Design an enzyme around this catalytic site. Structure first.
Site, PDB file in Angstrom:
ATOM      1  N   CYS B 106       0.833  -1.192   0.000  1.00 25.94           N
ATOM      2  CA  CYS B 106       0.000   0.000   0.000  1.00 25.94           C
ATOM      3  C   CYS B 106       0.870   1.244   0.000  1.00 25.94           C
ATOM      4  O   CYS B 106       1.591   1.522   0.967  1.00 25.94           O
ATOM      5  CB  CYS B 106      -0.919  -0.013   1.234  1.00 25.94           C
ATOM      6  SG  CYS B 106      -1.804   1.538   1.532  1.00 25.94           S
ATOM      7  N   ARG B 109       0.178   4.154   3.066  1.00 21.27           N
ATOM      8  CA  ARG B 109       0.344   3.951   4.508  1.00 21.27           C
ATOM      9  C   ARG B 109       0.832   5.157   5.342  1.00 21.27           C
ATOM     10  O   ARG B 109       0.915   5.062   6.564  1.00 21.27           O
ATOM     11  CB  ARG B 109       1.278   2.773   4.757  1.00 21.27           C
ATOM     12  CG  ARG B 109       0.694   1.437   4.400  1.00 21.27           C
ATOM     13  CD  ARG B 109       1.724   0.348   4.639  1.00 21.27           C
ATOM     14  NE  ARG B 109       2.691   0.284   3.553  1.00 21.27           N
ATOM     15  CZ  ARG B 109       3.728  -0.544   3.522  1.00 21.27           C
ATOM     16  NH1 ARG B 109       3.919  -1.389   4.523  1.00 21.27           N
ATOM     17  NH2 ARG B 109       4.559  -0.536   2.480  1.00 21.27           N
ATOM     18  N   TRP B 278      -8.640   6.838  -0.495  1.00 26.18           N
ATOM     19  CA  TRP B 278      -8.874   7.621  -1.698  1.00 26.18           C
ATOM     20  C   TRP B 278      -7.927   7.148  -2.800  1.00 26.18           C
ATOM     21  O   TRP B 278      -6.900   6.507  -2.547  1.00 26.18           O
ATOM     22  CB  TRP B 278      -8.717   9.122  -1.443  1.00 26.18           C
ATOM     23  CG  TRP B 278      -7.457   9.478  -0.785  1.00 26.18           C
ATOM     24  CD1 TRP B 278      -6.220   9.578  -1.370  1.00 26.18           C
ATOM     25  CD2 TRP B 278      -7.279   9.773   0.600  1.00 26.18           C
ATOM     26  NE1 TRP B 278      -5.282   9.921  -0.423  1.00 26.18           N
ATOM     27  CE2 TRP B 278      -5.906  10.042   0.796  1.00 26.18           C
ATOM     28  CE3 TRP B 278      -8.151   9.839   1.699  1.00 26.18           C
ATOM     29  CZ2 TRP B 278      -5.384  10.377   2.045  1.00 26.18           C
ATOM     30  CZ3 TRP B 278      -7.635  10.165   2.934  1.00 26.18           C
ATOM     31  CH2 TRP B 278      -6.262  10.434   3.100  1.00 26.18           C
TER      32      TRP B 278
HETATM   33  C1  HEM Z   1      -5.806   6.724   2.142  1.00 23.11           C
HETATM   34  C2  HEM Z   1      -5.087   6.645   1.016  1.00 23.11           C
HETATM   35  C3  HEM Z   1      -4.629   5.314   0.378  1.00 23.11           C
HETATM   36  C4  HEM Z   1      -3.914   5.232  -0.754  1.00 23.11           C
HETATM   37  C5  HEM Z   1      -3.431   6.418  -1.605  1.00 23.11           C
HETATM   38  C6  HEM Z   1      -3.700   3.834  -1.067  1.00 23.11           C
HETATM   39  C7  HEM Z   1      -2.993   3.345  -2.137  1.00 23.11           C
HETATM   40  C8  HEM Z   1      -2.860   2.009  -2.465  1.00 23.11           C
HETATM   41  C9  HEM Z   1      -2.460   1.465  -3.746  1.00 23.11           C
HETATM   42  C10 HEM Z   1      -2.093   2.254  -5.028  1.00 23.11           C
HETATM   43  C11 HEM Z   1      -2.452   0.136  -3.649  1.00 23.11           C
HETATM   44  C12 HEM Z   1      -2.126  -0.839  -4.811  1.00 23.11           C
HETATM   45  C13 HEM Z   1      -3.533  -1.162  -5.334  1.00 23.11           C
HETATM   46  C14 HEM Z   1      -3.598  -2.053  -6.556  1.00 23.11           C
HETATM   47  O1  HEM Z   1      -3.003  -1.683  -7.613  1.00 23.11           O
HETATM   48  O2  HEM Z   1      -4.283  -3.119  -6.471  1.00 23.11           O
HETATM   49  C15 HEM Z   1      -2.859  -0.212  -2.306  1.00 23.11           C
HETATM   50  C16 HEM Z   1      -2.991  -1.476  -1.790  1.00 23.11           C
HETATM   51  C17 HEM Z   1      -3.388  -1.804  -0.507  1.00 23.11           C
HETATM   52  N1  HEM Z   1      -3.853  -0.942   0.477  1.00 23.11           N
HETATM   53 FE1  HEM Z   1      -3.862   1.104   0.285  1.00 23.11          FE
HETATM   54  N2  HEM Z   1      -4.292   3.090  -0.059  1.00 23.11           N
HETATM   55  C18 HEM Z   1      -4.879   3.959   0.846  1.00 23.11           C
HETATM   56  C19 HEM Z   1      -5.586   3.591   1.974  1.00 23.11           C
HETATM   57  C20 HEM Z   1      -5.589   2.347   2.561  1.00 23.11           C
HETATM   58  C21 HEM Z   1      -6.292   1.975   3.778  1.00 23.11           C
HETATM   59  C22 HEM Z   1      -7.203   2.916   4.625  1.00 23.11           C
HETATM   60  C23 HEM Z   1      -6.033   0.679   3.997  1.00 23.11           C
HETATM   61  C24 HEM Z   1      -6.529  -0.217   5.153  1.00 23.11           C
HETATM   62  C25 HEM Z   1      -7.087   0.242   6.279  1.00 23.11           C
HETATM   63  C26 HEM Z   1      -5.149   0.204   2.953  1.00 23.11           C
HETATM   64  C27 HEM Z   1      -4.648  -1.066   2.831  1.00 23.11           C
HETATM   65  C28 HEM Z   1      -4.159  -1.617   1.662  1.00 23.11           C
HETATM   66  C29 HEM Z   1      -3.885  -3.019   1.478  1.00 23.11           C
HETATM   67  C30 HEM Z   1      -4.058  -4.144   2.512  1.00 23.11           C
HETATM   68  C31 HEM Z   1      -3.372  -3.140   0.041  1.00 23.11           C
HETATM   69  C32 HEM Z   1      -2.938  -4.419  -0.691  1.00 23.11           C
HETATM   70  C33 HEM Z   1      -4.015  -4.671  -1.742  1.00 23.11           C
HETATM   71  C34 HEM Z   1      -3.859  -6.042  -2.337  1.00 23.11           C
HETATM   72  O3  HEM Z   1      -2.895  -6.755  -1.926  1.00 23.11           O
HETATM   73  O4  HEM Z   1      -4.703  -6.407  -3.206  1.00 23.11           O
HETATM   74  N3  HEM Z   1      -4.903   1.241   2.078  1.00 23.11           N
HETATM   75  N4  HEM Z   1      -3.094   0.952  -1.607  1.00 23.11           N
HETATM   76  C1  LIG Z   2      -9.567   1.188  -1.059  1.00 17.60           C
HETATM   77  C2  LIG Z   2      -8.082   0.967  -1.181  1.00 17.60           C
HETATM   78  C3  LIG Z   2      -7.129   1.296  -0.205  1.00 17.60           C
HETATM   79  N1  LIG Z   2      -5.950   0.917  -0.730  1.00 17.60           N
HETATM   80  C4  LIG Z   2      -6.109   0.401  -1.940  1.00 17.60           C
HETATM   81  N2  LIG Z   2      -7.400   0.427  -2.230  1.00 17.60           N
HETATM   82  C5  LIG Z   2      -7.964  -0.077  -3.458  1.00 17.60           C
HETATM   83  N3  LIG Z   2      -9.037   0.482  -3.999  1.00 17.60           N
HETATM   84  C6  LIG Z   2      -9.575  -0.004  -5.140  1.00 17.60           C
HETATM   85  C7  LIG Z   2      -8.989  -1.128  -5.779  1.00 17.60           C
HETATM   86  C8  LIG Z   2      -7.852  -1.694  -5.163  1.00 17.60           C
HETATM   87  C9  LIG Z   2      -7.152  -2.916  -5.761  1.00 17.60           C
HETATM   88  C10 LIG Z   2      -7.057  -4.048  -4.731  1.00 17.60           C
HETATM   89  N4  LIG Z   2      -6.054  -4.996  -5.177  1.00 17.60           N
HETATM   90  C11 LIG Z   2      -6.457  -5.498  -6.468  1.00 17.60           C
HETATM   91  C12 LIG Z   2      -5.779  -6.839  -6.759  1.00 17.60           C
HETATM   92  C13 LIG Z   2      -6.751  -8.004  -6.606  1.00 17.60           C
HETATM   93  C14 LIG Z   2      -6.141  -9.264  -7.209  1.00 17.60           C
HETATM   94  C15 LIG Z   2      -6.723  -9.891  -8.312  1.00 17.60           C
HETATM   95  C16 LIG Z   2      -6.145 -11.039  -8.856  1.00 17.60           C
HETATM   96  C17 LIG Z   2      -4.986 -11.558  -8.289  1.00 17.60           C
HETATM   97  C18 LIG Z   2      -4.403 -10.927  -7.193  1.00 17.60           C
HETATM   98  F1  LIG Z   2      -3.281 -11.416  -6.641  1.00 17.60           F
HETATM   99  C19 LIG Z   2      -4.978  -9.776  -6.653  1.00 17.60           C
HETATM  100  N5  LIG Z   2      -7.395  -1.142  -4.022  1.00 17.60           N
END
Ligand code: HEM
Ligand SMILES: Cc1cncn1-c1nccc(CCNCCCc2cccc(F)c2)n1
Ligand code: HEM
Ligand SMILES: Cc1cncn1-c1nccc(CCNCCCc2cccc(F)c2)n1
Ligand SMILES: C[C@H](O)[C@H](O)[C@H]1CNc2nc(N)[nH]c(=O)c2N1
Ligand SMILES: C[C@H](O)[C@H](O)[C@H]1CNc2nc(N)[nH]c(=O)c2N1
Ligand SMILES: [Zn+2]
Lengths: 411, 407
Positions: B106, B109, B278
């Site tokens: 993420c 963070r 966001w």
């Molecule tokens: C507030 C601004 C935040 C931004 C700008 C942000 C940004 C991102 C981005 C760009 C990713 C990669 C997403 C993808 O391409 O699938 C990600 C993944 C992730 N975020 Fe954030 N995020 C935010 C908030 C949060 C919050 C509030 C949480 C949890 C309480 C969180 C937990 C995670 C987790 C667990 C992943 C891994 C997703 C996955 O493995 O599929 N994030 N975040």
């Molecule tokens: C709400 C938020 C906070 N941080 C990230 N998000 C956010 N928002 C909107 C979309 C996503 C993407 C979540 N991750 C997408 C990957 C899901 C997959 C799908 C197929 C194989 C994999 F290993 C993993 N993340």
């Protein structure tokens, strides 16, 4: 044990068994991944097994495993080792060796070409001057008037590590970088340390923004010596943009032949510390890294000014916008002058093919994703979506310490 | 075993010790790196609880205090008795904030400690779940001044009473397979769009139809609910330069909200724990709009730009991809809806790493995910070494509910 890798855009899954023939360590453990870490005099004791392993690979590839030619060769290498503590590779073995080191280069997106590599055998070389000659022929052959051919020139192997052959330059052709007293840098900032050395060593520097560095060659463990590549051998390309005419006025040019000279070639336990090799440029190497890294020519500022971009906010993506235009100019200019070059789309697409082919015929293709994915427009290339396994096969190209750090100065 | 990470653009070196706490495994070995692979009882439970509680009480400067010892005993007893245990509100918030702090993928963070946590373990039905989600969506959206939030449903019991939100994100667009052999709307959602219809959704079969919620409480058959439209803030996509842009008919929702993960705290498992923040601009413009397996509009946009799409060499895809992303950022800002660009975000993350190394001894990061899917090397995270490892509490992936659900 079999391991599968998936492509998440095409749902194509492949199976890897080749990773079982891997010995060297990655840097990773079950508890930690160091996949984004850039960097995570040999006895007869361990030499022969390395020798044997290589030779078995070699004879399998020629479909002669267990042959009399195979066993006799093993016996010969064995005896030469105990008698002499080392051994010499047949020409055929060296060629195979070199190709495969390339073919195992997990960080190289260009491996599709790996079978067509011209190997020059410089194992008879003895002096710096001899080195310069060999290098000149490499450049001339490789350049081929702009129609580039892959080549590697291989100097004598390390013996006791007190008689190392080395090419001090990181690349054969490269621009000087000069630190000014006001803190700013003229020319390529990557090359400042090396430039200073050259100067110290006796180089008279033109002190310009695009001066082709001299060769600093070291033979048989002796102090390195300077040589100036004949300018007529150094193909350069002036950079212009096809729509923006003020672009030529940035006074930018680049050289045509990318050629890495600071790596170590390991084959069958033998270490070749001077093994400069050359291919052709993927555009992003010049257009994104060489020109646009903050710690390099850093022309994003000046390009975006002339583009009249709103530089007041980074959320206008002026940086991303200038980056693309600069990359457009680089590819345009090289194609116009008919100097071989490949764009990041074409090159990653071929790699995908190459990779699939490698799984089918070889049982795997070690690849480093952090390195294979291009430094702009990542996800609109097919490699971004491709899972990759990274592991180390021999023969291999390894890093080695800068020789100015290790060298013992004679005088 | 005291590791160092280097930034190769600034020469800053950080020393990592936090990794030495890492409990879970990575998929990698000494012989193979899997860094680009997308997915690499009372006697189990109590050591798990202890580790959590220890690090919790240490975080409040009462390590080894009576309150600490008291609680450790209290929980030990409940596990012996009930086989599970329950978290104090304080532990629950600390836990959730830290699962976020530990999310190595993420980029966002830096905001980790400002997480609104909605405790919803008293929930019992899907209707009840819908009401909790609606409230979460309203609070987080905040008329476009987005606030981070998580809502947490009862923890798992015997795996037969799992709460689950079947949606992958709370707010997402339907995808419909055409007789045309093509795909209208969002291809990522085609199968889910089916299941909604199978459970009874009446699809308007548009391009940007907001999917309904498909909520599951206590392991029951899941139920459909349509989010009130007045709570789904959307942004019409226009370009500040190309008047024709509006004619492409594109819009996107303002609240990203991951709903399909499993939140693990002190050994307990929360299978339904939607969270939202966001958007980083590229999430939409690069991945959602331009992935081949998604809305794949690059062709249409470059055509509209009259670029020579004849050869890859022209970098028309690159040219368009930028403009689109300029537009997305433009649209959201013009509607006062929070969004952040990849330069600002990655820069923020570099700062976050420096703080974490300083105040915690490190920060687990996954380079393959942190570097944005465009303009990789002109962002600072590109030149930044990162160590990746799994600290707990954590958000883990879990199977899609349909594949599991005992019907
Ligand atoms: C507030 C601004 C935040 C931004 C700008 C942000 C940004 C991102 C981005 C760009 C990713 C990669 C997403 C993808 O391409 O699938 C990600 C993944 C992730 N975020 Fe954030 N995020 C935010 C908030 C949060 C919050 C509030 C949480 C949890 C309480 C969180 C937990 C995670 C987790 C667990 C992943 C891994 C997703 C996955 O493995 O599929 N994030 N975040
Ligand atoms: C709400 C938020 C906070 N941080 C990230 N998000 C956010 N928002 C909107 C979309 C996503 C993407 C979540 N991750 C997408 C990957 C899901 C997959 C799908 C197929 C194989 C994999 F290993 C993993 N993340
Ligand atoms: C002919 C076209 C070739 C292309 C397009 C190509 C492409 C690339 C690129 C883009 C990189 C990334 C390096 C960086 O950004 O630092 C790379 C790395 C590498 N390539 Fe190639 N290459 C080619 C030929 C070769 C040849 C001929 C060899 C060896 C015989 C080779 C071996 C390697 C090795 C060992 C690396 C890793 C370098 C390092 O880790 O510093 N490549 N390649
Ligand atoms: C000639 C060639 C064939 N294939 C790639 N090249 C090529 N050409 C021109 C330049 C380069 C760059 C090679 N990589 C340079 C990076 C060197 C570093 C610097 C710091 C830490 C590291 F681990 C490694 N490669
Ligand atoms: C193949 C590779 O592991 C996969 O495509 C990853 C690469 N990096 C990513 N990075 C982010 N932020 N999100 C993703 O979905 C992915 N996908
Ligand atoms: C820290 C990070 O891994 C490092 O900057 C890497 C990232 N990927 C790269 N990829 C290529 N092709 N060349 C590089 O120099 C790097 N640098
Ligand atoms: Zn790894």
């Amino acid at each position: 044990r079999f391991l599968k890798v998936k492509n998440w855009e095409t749902d194509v899954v492949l199976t890897d068994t080749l990773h079982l023939k891997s010995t060297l360590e990655t840097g990773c453990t079950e508890h930690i991944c160091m996949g984004s870490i850039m960097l995570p005099v040999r006895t007869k004791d361990q030499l022969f097994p390395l020798a044997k392993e290589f030779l078995d690979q070699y004879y399998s590839s020629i479909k002669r495993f267990g042959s009399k030619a195979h066993m006799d060769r093993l016996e010969e290498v064995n005896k030469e080792i105990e008698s002499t503590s080392t051994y010499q590779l047949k020409d055929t073995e060296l060629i195979y060796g070199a190709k495969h080191a390339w073919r195992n280069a997990s960080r190289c997106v260009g491996r599709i070409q790996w079978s067509k590599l011209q190997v020059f055998d410089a194992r008879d070389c003895t002096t710096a001057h001899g080195m310069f000659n060999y290098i000149c022929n490499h450049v001339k052959y490789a350049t081929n008037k702009g129609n580039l051919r892959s080549a590697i020139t291989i100097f004598p192997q390390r013996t006791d590590g007190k008689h190392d052959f080395r090419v001090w330059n990181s690349q054969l052709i490269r621009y000087a970088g000069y630190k000014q007293p006001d803190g700013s840098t003229l020319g390529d900032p990557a090359n400042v340390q090396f430039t200073e050395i050259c100067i110290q060593q006796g180089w008279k520097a033109p002190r310009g923004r695009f001066d082709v560095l001299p060769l600093l060659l070291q033979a048989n463990g002796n102090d390195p010596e300077l040589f100036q590549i004949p300018p007529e051998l150094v193909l350069e390309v002036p950079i212009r943009h096809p729509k923006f005419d003020w672009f030529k006025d940035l006074g930018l040019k680049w050289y045509g032949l990318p050629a890495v000279s600071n790596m170590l070639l390991e084959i069958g336990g033998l270490e070749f510390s001077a093994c400069p090799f050359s291919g052709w440029y993927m555009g992003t190497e010049i257009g994104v890294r060489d020109y646009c890294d903050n710690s390099r020519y850093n022309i994003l500022e000046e390009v975006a000014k002339k583009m009249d971009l709103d530089m007041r906010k980074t959320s206008s993506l002026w940086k991303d916008q200038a980056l693309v235009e600069i990359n457009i100019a680089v590819l345009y200019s090289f194609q116009s002058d008919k100097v071989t070059i490949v764009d990041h789309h074409s090159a990653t697409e071929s790699f995908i093919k190459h990779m699939e082919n490698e799984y089918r015929c070889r049982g795997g293709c070690p690849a480093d994703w952090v390195w294979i994915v291009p430094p702009m427009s990542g996800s609109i290339t097919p490699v971004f979506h491709q899972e990759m396994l990274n592991y180390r096969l021999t023969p291999s190209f390894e890093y080695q310490p800068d020789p100015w750090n290790t060298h013992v100065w004679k005088g």
